[PDB]
Every structure is written in C-alpha cells, then in structure tokens.
Design a protein around this nucleic acid. Structure first.
Ligand SMILES: [Mg+2]
Ligand SMILES: [Mg+2]
Ligand SMILES: [Mg+2]
Ligand SMILES: [Mg+2]
Ligand SMILES: [Mg+2]
Ligand SMILES: [Mg+2]
Ligand SMILES: [Mg+2]
Ligand SMILES: [Mg+2]
Ligand SMILES: [Mg+2]
Ligand SMILES: [Mg+2]
Ligand SMILES: [Mg+2]
Ligand SMILES: [Mg+2]
Ligand SMILES: [Mg+2]
Ligand SMILES: [Mg+2]
Ligand SMILES: [Mg+2]
Ligand SMILES: [Mg+2]
Ligand SMILES: [Mg+2]
Ligand SMILES: [Mg+2]
Ligand SMILES: [Mg+2]
Ligand SMILES: [Mg+2]
Ligand SMILES: [Mg+2]
Ligand SMILES: [Mg+2]
Ligand SMILES: [Mg+2]
Ligand SMILES: [Mg+2]
Ligand SMILES: [Mg+2]
Ligand SMILES: [Mg+2]
Ligand SMILES: [Mg+2]
Ligand SMILES: [Mg+2]
Ligand SMILES: [Mg+2]
Ligand SMILES: [Mg+2]
Ligand SMILES: [Mg+2]
Ligand SMILES: [Mg+2]
Ligand SMILES: [Mg+2]
Ligand SMILES: [Mg+2]
Ligand SMILES: [Mg+2]
Ligand SMILES: [Mg+2]
Ligand SMILES: [Mg+2]
Ligand SMILES: [Mg+2]
Ligand SMILES: [Mg+2]
Ligand SMILES: [Mg+2]
Ligand SMILES: [Mg+2]
Ligand SMILES: [Mg+2]
Ligand SMILES: [Mg+2]
Ligand SMILES: [Mg+2]
Ligand SMILES: [Mg+2]
Ligand SMILES: [Mg+2]
Ligand SMILES: [Mg+2]
Ligand SMILES: [Mg+2]
Ligand SMILES: [Mg+2]
Ligand SMILES: [Mg+2]
Ligand SMILES: [Mg+2]
Ligand SMILES: [Mg+2]
Ligand SMILES: [Mg+2]
Ligand SMILES: [Mg+2]
Ligand SMILES: [Mg+2]
Ligand SMILES: [Mg+2]
Ligand SMILES: [Mg+2]
Ligand SMILES: [Mg+2]
Ligand SMILES: [Mg+2]
Ligand SMILES: [Mg+2]
Ligand SMILES: [Mg+2]
Ligand SMILES: [Mg+2]
Ligand SMILES: [Mg+2]
Ligand SMILES: [Mg+2]
Ligand SMILES: [Mg+2]
Ligand SMILES: [Mg+2]
Ligand SMILES: [Mg+2]
Ligand SMILES: [Mg+2]
Ligand SMILES: [Mg+2]
Lengths: 213, 121, 112, 54, 116
RNA sequence: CAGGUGGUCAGGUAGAGCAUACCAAGGCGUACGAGAUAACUAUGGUUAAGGAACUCGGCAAAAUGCCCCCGUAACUUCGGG
RNA sequence: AAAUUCCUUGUCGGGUAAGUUCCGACCUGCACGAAUGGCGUAACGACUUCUCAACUGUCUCAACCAUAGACUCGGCGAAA
RNA sequence: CUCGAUGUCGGCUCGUCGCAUCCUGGGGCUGGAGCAGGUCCCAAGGGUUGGGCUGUUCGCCCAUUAAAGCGGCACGCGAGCUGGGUUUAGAACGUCGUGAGACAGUUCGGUCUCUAUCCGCCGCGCGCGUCAGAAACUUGAGGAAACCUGUCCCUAGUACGAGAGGACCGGGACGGACGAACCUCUGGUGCACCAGUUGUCCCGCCAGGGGCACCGCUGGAUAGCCACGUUCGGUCAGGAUAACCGCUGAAAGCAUCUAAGCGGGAAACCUUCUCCAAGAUCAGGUUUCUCACCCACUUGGUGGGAUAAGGCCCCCCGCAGAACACGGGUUCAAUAGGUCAGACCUGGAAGCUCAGUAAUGGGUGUAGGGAACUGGUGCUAACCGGCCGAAAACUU
C-alpha cells in the first residue's frame, strides 16, 4: 500500500502551527506524475509502476525514448522512475495513462523522501569521516589534518579492506525517514515537509509513504 | 557552560563565584544551559559567611551569555552566566534571588526559585 | 521576489508598525503560565533587524536588575500580541552592537 | 622512498605508452578563396581574418 | 560583478583590480585589445558596467567611473563618444573572439573589442 | 647561489629618531610561464560560548605597549626595588 | 628528606574539588659540614622550579578566507 | 634469524580481533520474604566519561555514570606525529678510586632524514568483453553500514513485609552520547559589498576621490561553505536457536526433556529498514529505435570505404569537479554575461540650498552604492563542423 510521487525540491522556509510553534519546512513541488508502465510478476518477476515527471521539449528526446513513450501513449517527460510496490500487485490501482497529484498524501501523515545529496568533491578524512586530526601546537610537524597510523606492523603486513580514507564525497542517494507532511497545497501542488530534504534546490526528489510511520 | 567555567552566584548564600566541575544529566554531557544542574566549587565568598571557600556545592544555571532557542522561535540572551546554589530537593539554599531568570526553570520544575526571582523572562 | 513567496504570503501578519533600529518598543508577548495565557510586556531598544520577510527577526535589549537582557523575536510571530512604538531613535548604523558594553548614562540614545 | 628494484621492459612500456598527445579535430574554412583547415574553436577568428595560416 | 571563484589574476586581488582597470583603459582607448582568454572573460562584464555608467552620463556617473579609471582622456572619450554611440543598445557592448595560442607558454589568447 | 664583504654621501611629510609608513632624486619589476575555488602542507587572517580543561611544560599564539599628570609595597649594601 | 635521602609518593602543616611537583618544619644525615669553604644575603639572570592575575584556536572542537605549492596545459629536464 | 643497522618507554592518531563479560539481554541455584545481592551457565550487537599528581605504564584521588572490562596484534601503530624518561659529547652533588675516571644513584642542557618503484587500501577514468549497433527503466547472487542507554509518571504505596521499606509484568513523556542530511532560524567566516577613520602621495587646486600601509585599521554584512544551529535515525514483525524450561515416552512392567517425535526460549544468527551491486565471464530481465549499403580479393566468421539509430569532440555554463567523469544548454535558445525590475546588505550619496565664525548640522530623499537569490528582456557569445558508429553459420 506504498504511495509514491516524483517531485522537485523548491527550498526551505518556516511556518507556524496551531500551538504557535515555528516549523522549519522544506517545500517540495510534487508535480503531476504519469505512470507509463506497470511491472507485473508474470512478465518481469516483481511488482512496480513507472512514473513520468517533468515537462520537456519533444525535440530533446531521442528516437528510442520517444518510441517507449509512444507505446504507452503519453507525452515524453524529463524523468522516469519506478515505484517498487509490494508482492501484492493486485494488478490495479494503477492504469497506464493515470495522473497522480499531491493529494495522495494528507496533513499529519508521514513520508520518506529520497534524493541525491549535494556534491562535496575530494574530501579529507576530517571532513569525510570526522577524524580528530593531530594537535596544532606542542611540536606537531605537518600532521595537523593527517590521518596518522593506518595499520599495525609485520602482523599483518597489509591494510584491511574498507579502511576509512580521503576520497570523493557526496552525490550519494540518500533517504530520510519519517518526515511529517505539515500541509499539502492542492492548488499549486506542493508539499510542506517538516525538516531537511537531501540535495540541492531544483533536484529531483521521490516522496513515498513511510514504512515505519 | 562546561567544566572549568566560572559563574556568578545569584543568591545570598554568601558565595560570589563558583567553578563548574561536572555537568550532570548523563555521562560525558558537554554543555549546561538554563535549567541544568551543576556540581561546582566555591572559588570566592563573603568573609565570615555561611558558605566557605572550597566547598563543593550543587547549583542550577539561570542565566547564559549564549542565546537559547525557544519552541516558538524566539531567543533569550543575558549578559552574564549565573547560577543558584540548591539543596538536594531543588530548593535554593539562599533566601532570595538577584536579577532575572529564564523561563526554562518552569519546565525544569524549579518553582521555588521561580517564585523567589525578581523577574522571569 | 522569491520562489517561495506564494507559500509565505498567507502567513504574513499585518498591524506591524514601522520601526527601525534604535527605537524604543513595547512588545506584548503571550505567556503560558499553566493554562492562563496572560500578556507579558518587554520594553527596550531595538538593536537589529535581520531581514527576510516571513523569516525576518528583530532583537530588543533592556536592563532589568543590573543585568542586560536581549530577546529575539520573529516578526510575524503569532506569539506577539501587538507591537507599540514609544520613541524614535537617532543612530548612524543598522546593528547597534556597541550597546552591549555600555552601562548607565553612556548607553542612552538620542530622541529623534 | 626509493624504488626497490628496476622495472621490467613490459612494465615500463605499459606506462610509458600512455604519455601521448591528443589530436585536435579540424574543420574546413575558405578565406579569400583559399581553403584552409582550422580547429573549430578558431572558426570565428579565421572568418574575421585574425588567423595567420603561415 | 560576480567575484572571481578561485585564485585572482596576476597574483592577488589588488593586482587583479589594477589589471582590470588597465585593460579597461586600453580597451576604451583602442577599441580592440588582444590578451589572454581568462583576462578577456574577466574583463567583459567589468567594462560593460563602465559603459553603462557612461550611457547614463551624469556627473555622479562620471565620478563613479573616475573611482576606477585614472586616465582622464579615456574618461572623456568614454563619456563623449562611447556612451552616446551605445545609447540605443541595451547591454552586450563587447565581443570576445578566440585566436591562436602564443608560444612560450601555450596560453590561450583572445581579442576583445567594442561591438562597433 | 635567499649567505659574507671595509669606507664615503644620504632629500620630503609625519616622527625623539639613521626606527617606522608613504614619497623625491635616482633605480627596478631579477630571466620559466598560463590556468584552476580537490585533499593535504606552508605563510598569514577571523572566529559563537568557555578560558590552560591542552601539554612533560602556557611550547606557540594572544595580551601589555606611547606622551603628560597623580601614586607607588616587603626588603635593602641606602645606590636601589 | 637537600642539585646530597636508597627505603620514598618518609611524617606533620599550607596550598588544590582532587598535589609523587612546590613552600615550612621534624631529624631516623644509606652517603652534609667550614677557603675542593659553611651559613645567609639587597641587586642581577634568553638559568632550573612552583603559584596567581590578564589573555587567548593550546584545548572542548572545529569552521571559513587569501597567498605559495600540490592539480592541468606548453618548454626544459635530474636524483637516490 | 637479524652486527656491510630488525629504531628502543610513555603519549597522540587510526584501528582490528578474542572472550577468560564491566553495562545492557536470557536463565539455574541460593543461608533468594520484597528492594537489593551472592554464585554458576548462555551471550561479543552496541556501549564502556572528564580531570588532579607523576616522563611515565602502573597507582592514589576528585566529580560523574548503566558501565567506567581483561588481553593479542614487533609489550599494534616514529618512510604517521612528539621527544617528557632511558642511551653520547658539557657541568655539578653524594659515594668509590692515589689518579685518569666510575655509579641499573641524583641533577640542569642536549640536530628525529627520505620527491612512493611494488604489494595493500581510499577514490576516479581509459580499453575490451558480455555474438548486430544503440537508448531508457530495472531484478538482486553477494556485500557494506547501523545496532547504545538514562530519568520521571500510571499500575501502586499494589504484591511482599511486624514495620522500616517496597515490587514483577505491561502502558506513556522527556533526555544524554553517536550518526546522516540540510541552511528556515541562531551563530561563525567573508580579499571585486557598504560605511567610518589615521599617516602619506597623487588626480592642477577646492570639493569629490584614488594608490600603499596585514583586506591599513574599525563597524556591519546577502551568497557559498559550515556548527555552536535545524530535522531525522537506531523501531516494529517473522524464522531458526544458546543456556534453560517442558509435552508425549520405552529400552529398564516404575521413572526418565530422548533414544522416535513435538513445543517455548536472548541486544547473539537469518529475513525486515538504509546503501552498493550483472567484470554475477552463469556477464541477467522488460522494453523501444536503426534495421541499411558500395569496392577489392586467394571469396575468406576476409580486407576496405560510406552510413542509419545513437554518441563523442568543439562551443556557452554548473551548487558537478584535481585531470577525467557527471549534469544543463546551443537561435524552434533565457545557458552564461549584459540590461531592466524585485529581494537583501549597508545606512542617508554627489550636486545644489539653508543655518552656523568654524568644526558641523538640516532639506532635496528610505537617499545613493552593491556580488552570488528570483523574474522579464533575444543585446554579446553558444558558430557556416568534424570524428566515430549496424549481424558467417549450424543442431534439435
Ligand atoms: Mg583540532
Ligand atoms: Mg616538532
Ligand atoms: Mg619539517
Ligand atoms: Mg605547523
Ligand atoms: Mg600478512
Ligand atoms: Mg534589513
Ligand atoms: Mg569567494
Ligand atoms: Mg593593499
Ligand atoms: Mg648573491
Ligand atoms: Mg658587517
Ligand atoms: Mg628621512
Ligand atoms: Mg627603514
Ligand atoms: Mg612604497
Ligand atoms: Mg600560477
Ligand atoms: Mg586544479
Ligand atoms: Mg573564541
Ligand atoms: Mg568572544
Ligand atoms: Mg591559570
Ligand atoms: Mg592540566
Ligand atoms: Mg590531560
Ligand atoms: Mg612564549
Ligand atoms: Mg603577537
Ligand atoms: Mg632530613
Ligand atoms: Mg648524601
Ligand atoms: Mg616527601
Ligand atoms: Mg603541574
Ligand atoms: Mg622542603
Ligand atoms: Mg680547615
Ligand atoms: Mg664535599
Ligand atoms: Mg677544605
Ligand atoms: Mg662557593
Ligand atoms: Mg646556603
Ligand atoms: Mg649575562
Ligand atoms: Mg640566563
Ligand atoms: Mg626540590
Ligand atoms: Mg609539464
Ligand atoms: Mg644486530
Ligand atoms: Mg660491523
Ligand atoms: Mg641489506
Ligand atoms: Mg585493543
Ligand atoms: Mg562464555
Ligand atoms: Mg532477607
Ligand atoms: Mg544469578
Ligand atoms: Mg558484545
Ligand atoms: Mg544481528
Ligand atoms: Mg610497540
Ligand atoms: Mg621519527
Ligand atoms: Mg612504521
Ligand atoms: Mg612510541
Ligand atoms: Mg617501516
Ligand atoms: Mg630529553
Ligand atoms: Mg632530563
Ligand atoms: Mg661528562
Ligand atoms: Mg678521595
Ligand atoms: Mg654508566
Ligand atoms: Mg612523503
Ligand atoms: Mg542479498
Ligand atoms: Mg566477487
Ligand atoms: Mg555531514
Ligand atoms: Mg539563506
Ligand atoms: Mg546567520
Ligand atoms: Mg568598492
Ligand atoms: Mg588615504
Ligand atoms: Mg581636499
Ligand atoms: Mg604609489
Ligand atoms: Mg548566510
Ligand atoms: Mg513425564
Ligand atoms: Mg554535454
Ligand atoms: Mg546629499
């Protein structure tokens, strides 16, 4: 009974609730979605539904993708993603060409928001893993942000797999759990979600009903 | 407020300045705000007063230089860090409070201090 | 203009008098003292207006009992009953932070 | 840190062959009737006559 | 305009300020300048803002331009010919044309010129 | 070749000054460059609240700093301090 | 109980919330002692040692900025 | 074994493993009334504090905590750091020696080198393969990360207990530590922002400004990056079990948890939540597009050439970024710049005028200046283009 929608992160603001408390909200433009495809067990081995979101010029879509959209008889969109349902497909509640909007959620509900975190570039150990570094005085020689030891000795004469080191950081797929939907605005089709949502403003975001609630 | 911080005593026990020894409320707790309980030592007192220098006491923070958020989105910030020496039952050992105090004492259940204070903000 | 202006518009409050840093202000705030909802008044000098519309805040400073106090409220906060302007000040800057280390007679502000 | 032993011919050559120049793609342009070949990023300069073909 | 992201031209920011002023003076004086491509790209908006001041063409704008340029003859021609020439054009007063890189350091080069 | 090398001359404004800052006369831009917001290193700068809790140790940094007028302890070899 | 004391962090007192260091004594001086000087001593010390005020990125606990490198392109072009 | 050198204590930084378990979890017995214990068995998922003294390890102590575990890894870790002790040359005390000197006695001082070749590890690309060439969406074989805990309240002053004292089990609220994302708020920073101001020099002079002095200094400060900030998390539910507790039940007419069989049973293990993932060479699945030529030859599952779908380079850019890659755009264009208008930051421009002997003040005027955010605008540059790139059969 999972519900899902694709949207765009519009940014953060603040609002006040009935108890006169400030609520930091992230505004998500859960735009209108089209389905374009259903994954059935008998045909693919699992249950899911595709979702198409985002206005795009037909000139910018190549022939294969255009043919895929033509088969389902919908106009091409920018993004395309699948909402993985449970094994109980029920082969219904989703017809090809159906439109989804933001009213599939309600005030006071809980959602799961997944996105792509902002890129951080090549990052050192202190930033990437919270290493303590070394001292800034008392004789320390050029090791103020260096990791220090990375192993033992002749036993063992190697470095183990998965040791924390410096490298590229960010641009990961991240999901945040149990975000309260403060309010859904039906006219402009946005969701006011309390808290922080991964990624940058304008990034694609998928909103799903929380499994744990 | 953390360990080694010094605070001004806001009551009439005779102590002037105390030094924070431990922030109670859990192992390795770092900062004590308004409404938090402190183990402290008396670094200065009025001569021939009730409390002497070097006594280990228990106190509650009532004023902080660092501004503190409130659930409605407002903040409060004082010009000094001040505490009140209390008894094991959370009653102040002194008889009156000097200066204003923060409203978080209400939710921390320090009603006696709240009543004794000249002003609650 | 901002992208979230349509979101923030219904929550913008009216009846906010125009005031600037340096002015003297009465702020009537709601207080939950049990289940009573009385109205406490904070009287002091505005020292800051960090802009932003629905997220704009301001800070007021006073001296209660030998101790200086600062309160930072969001403009448009429903917890503020009303704002009342007492006097207008004459200052040269926008942040008035220097008042944080002046006491007594040196801390006053001109009255125009 | 110094090399422990000299590299073999194969190991040296595998790395050494990766030091090479990338070739620039050229387009066609005619100036004063004479036809030349220039990198595309200099097409505007070639048309306006700021390119010395030598 | 938008500040340089990354290290400033010619060493420091004060040197970059001087470099931009000198390049703008030379561009207004000659109508056409050949330099390194990063310098031309940095110069473009800086020069267009001065041309906008000259288009406005008041005493206040002249003082604003003099805050940056030190060549009074160049200021005069900027306020007497350049601004009047571009009175009817809204933005886009310059143009960058990429040319062959120079020997010695293979630095990419370009010319920047007033549109006419 | 960022080291070393005796003597002479030595302007202005501010300043006690041959210190220091900006200039004159006179010299020079000194010999790889052009780019680019990686980590990390170096040299500088700023930092909420706390204030030596750091550490072998206040190492390093921060702080004090000028002129004029008051005032100045124990001790002392009577000069000082 | 020392630039001398092994036992030893000797015992008592002060200082600290907590003092193997410090200061004052005790004398059980392993192994002090009178020109290889004994005991003091105002002034002096880039000497050793303990405490305090002030101050601070030393630290809680890190964050940001500029520059020189590191990184890319062209030229020259080593070493263990 | 190492003398043609294997760097020696303590500390920092980074860890990893064992269980002989310190806390949290589950039990048996008890000289276990209850609260609390003792002892033994199972259990290694997570957690296991900050200071004073000492070169210290160790140890004593202070204040907390649910707890302040014990060990291996060259007594882990100096081509990662330090150099307080030890272990050179200086000097002194005690003691020993006639002396030179000596002392696992003491004391003060005392150079820590190296551009990473290989393996290993952390990241990122290029090629090829996956039997035509491509594009989009995917399954999950198998891995990785995470796993903490307190206080208060109801039950209930109930059970128990002479009283004192004081429950099990269930049901709520608020915390501490840790981690992730994010920038609305608070707070920090801010080198092409605004304002004040000192010295000096310059713009012919006044006025107005500019260069240098750490960004000269000082007061602020949008964007971005951030934590001291905001939000969220570690849950619930199944399965098989450890210790342990059983049902049925003979051998052995009784008994017996067991030899047949069937149950309960923990933070341990497997599913469940998050992330990676078909180089998973067993190289997967669902789809959609092109689906086409010409030349030579020893006619070859042969060499070439030209293309389709598609892609790349070039070009304008990015909150994507070391290069590379990734994302967006390229006139049917709002991509960057300019420009106009907002938002916001600063705080009342210049010129003119009035007042004042003057320093200065008032008016014109929420002024002027201005970056990052938002919207309009087709003015500048995104061009008049190059390189890649599609199939022998055969068996049932
Ligand atoms: Mg640090
Ligand atoms: Mg060192
Ligand atoms: Mg060094
Ligand atoms: Mg250093
Ligand atoms: Mg090995
Ligand atoms: Mg404002
Ligand atoms: Mg910047
Ligand atoms: Mg300068
Ligand atoms: Mg020389
Ligand atoms: Mg000499
Ligand atoms: Mg002179
Ligand atoms: Mg000099
Ligand atoms: Mg000079
Ligand atoms: Mg350079
Ligand atoms: Mg680079
Ligand atoms: Mg600070
Ligand atoms: Mg401060
Ligand atoms: Mg101190
Ligand atoms: Mg210490
Ligand atoms: Mg320590
Ligand atoms: Mg020093
Ligand atoms: Mg200094
Ligand atoms: Mg003795
Ligand atoms: Mg002796
Ligand atoms: Mg002793
Ligand atoms: Mg000490
Ligand atoms: Mg003594
Ligand atoms: Mg004699
Ligand atoms: Mg002797
Ligand atoms: Mg003698
Ligand atoms: Mg002597
Ligand atoms: Mg003596
Ligand atoms: Mg001397
Ligand atoms: Mg000396
Ligand atoms: Mg001694
Ligand atoms: Mg090179
Ligand atoms: Mg040997
Ligand atoms: Mg030998
Ligand atoms: Mg050898
Ligand atoms: Mg270990
Ligand atoms: Mg065991
Ligand atoms: Mg009993
Ligand atoms: Mg037991
Ligand atoms: Mg365990
Ligand atoms: Mg597990
Ligand atoms: Mg070792
Ligand atoms: Mg070393
Ligand atoms: Mg080593
Ligand atoms: Mg060591
Ligand atoms: Mg080694
Ligand atoms: Mg030493
Ligand atoms: Mg020593
Ligand atoms: Mg010697
Ligand atoms: Mg003798
Ligand atoms: Mg010896
Ligand atoms: Mg190295
Ligand atoms: Mg799996
Ligand atoms: Mg494998
Ligand atoms: Mg993070
Ligand atoms: Mg913002
Ligand atoms: Mg802020
Ligand atoms: Mg400026
Ligand atoms: Mg000046
Ligand atoms: Mg003047
Ligand atoms: Mg000059
Ligand atoms: Mg900001
Ligand atoms: Mg039975
Ligand atoms: Mg592209
Ligand atoms: Mg004016």
């Amino acid at each position: 009974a999972r519900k899902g929608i694709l949207g765009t992160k519009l940014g953060m603001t603040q609002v006040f609730d009935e108890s006169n408390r400030v609520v930091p909200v992230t505004v998500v433009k859960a735009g209108p979605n089209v389905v374009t495809r259903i994954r059935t067990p008998e045909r693919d081995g699992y249950s899911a539904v595709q979702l198409a979101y985002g206005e795009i010029s037909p000139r910018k879509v190549n022939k294969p993708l255009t043919g895929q959209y033509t088969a389902a008889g919908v106009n091409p969109r920018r993004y395309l993603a699948e909402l993985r349902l449970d094994d109980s497909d029920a082969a219904t509640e989703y017809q090809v060409g159906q439109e989804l909007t933001a009213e599939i959620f309600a005030d006071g509900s809980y959602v799961d928001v997944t996105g792509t975190s902002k890129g951080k570039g090549f990052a050192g150990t202190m930033k990437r893993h919270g290493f303590r570094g070394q001292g800034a005085s008392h004789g320390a020689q050029a090791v103020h942000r260096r990791p220090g030891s990375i192993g033992g000795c002749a036993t063992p004469a190697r470095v183990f797999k998965g040791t924390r080191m410096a490298g590229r950081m960010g641009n990961d797929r991240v999901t945040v759990l149990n975000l309260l939907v403060h309010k859904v605005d039906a006219e402009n089709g946005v969701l006011l979600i309390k808290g922080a949502v991964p990624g940058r403003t304008g990034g694609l975001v998928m909103v799903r009903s929380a499994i744990k609630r | 407020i953390q360990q080694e911080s010094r605070l001004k005593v806001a009551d009439n026990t005779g102590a002037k300045e105390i030094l924070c020894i431990r922030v109670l409320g859990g192992s390795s707790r770092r900062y004590a705000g308004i409404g938090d309980v402190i183990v402290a030592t008396v670094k200065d007192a009025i001569p021939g007063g009730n409390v002497k220098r070097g006594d280990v006491v228990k106190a509650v923070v009532v004023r902080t230089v660092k501004e503190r958020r409130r659930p409605d989105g407002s903040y409060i910030k004082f010009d000094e860090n001040a505490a009140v020496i209390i008894k094991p039952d959370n009653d102040p050992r002194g008889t009156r409070i000097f200066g204003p105090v923060g409203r978080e004492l209400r939710e921390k259940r320090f009603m006696k201090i709240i009543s004794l204070a000249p002003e609650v903000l | 203009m901002n992208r979230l202006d349509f979101v923030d518009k219904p929550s913008l409050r009216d009846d906010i008098p125009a005031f600037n840093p340096g002015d003297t202000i009465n702020v009537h705030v709601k207080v939950i003292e049990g289940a009573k909802e009385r109205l406490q008044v904070f009287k002091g000098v505005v020292i800051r207006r960090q802009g932003g519309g629905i997220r704009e805040t301001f800070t007021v400073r006073k001296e209660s009992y030998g101790v200086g106090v600062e309160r930072t409220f969001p403009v448009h906060s429903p917890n503020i009953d009303h704002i009342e302007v007492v006097t207008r000040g004459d200052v040269r800057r926008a942040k008035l932070y220097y008042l944080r280390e002046l006491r007594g007679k040196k801390a006053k502000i001109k009255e125009k | 840190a110094v090399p422990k032993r000299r590299k073999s011919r194969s190991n040296t050559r595998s790395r050494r062959s990766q030091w090479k120049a990338a070739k620039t793609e050229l387009v066609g342009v005619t100036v004063a009737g004479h036809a030349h070949k220039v990198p595309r990023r200099l097409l505007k300069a070639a048309r306006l006559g700021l390119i010395d073909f030598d | 305009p938008k500040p340089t992201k990354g290290p400033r031209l010619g060493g420091s920011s004060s040197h970059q300020k001087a470099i931009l002023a000198n390049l703008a003076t030379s561009l207004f004086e000659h109508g056409r300048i050949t330099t390194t491509e990063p310098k031309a790209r940095a110069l473009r908006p800086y020069a267009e803002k001065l041309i906008t001041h000259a288009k406005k063409g008041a005493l206040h704008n002249r003082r604003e331009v003099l805050k940056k340029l030190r060549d009074k003859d160049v200021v005069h021609t900027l306020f007497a010919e350049i601004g009047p020439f571009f009175a009817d054009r809204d933005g886009g007063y310059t143009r960058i044309i990429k040319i062959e890189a120079r020997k010695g350091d293979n630095a990419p080069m370009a010319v920047i010129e007033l549109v006419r």
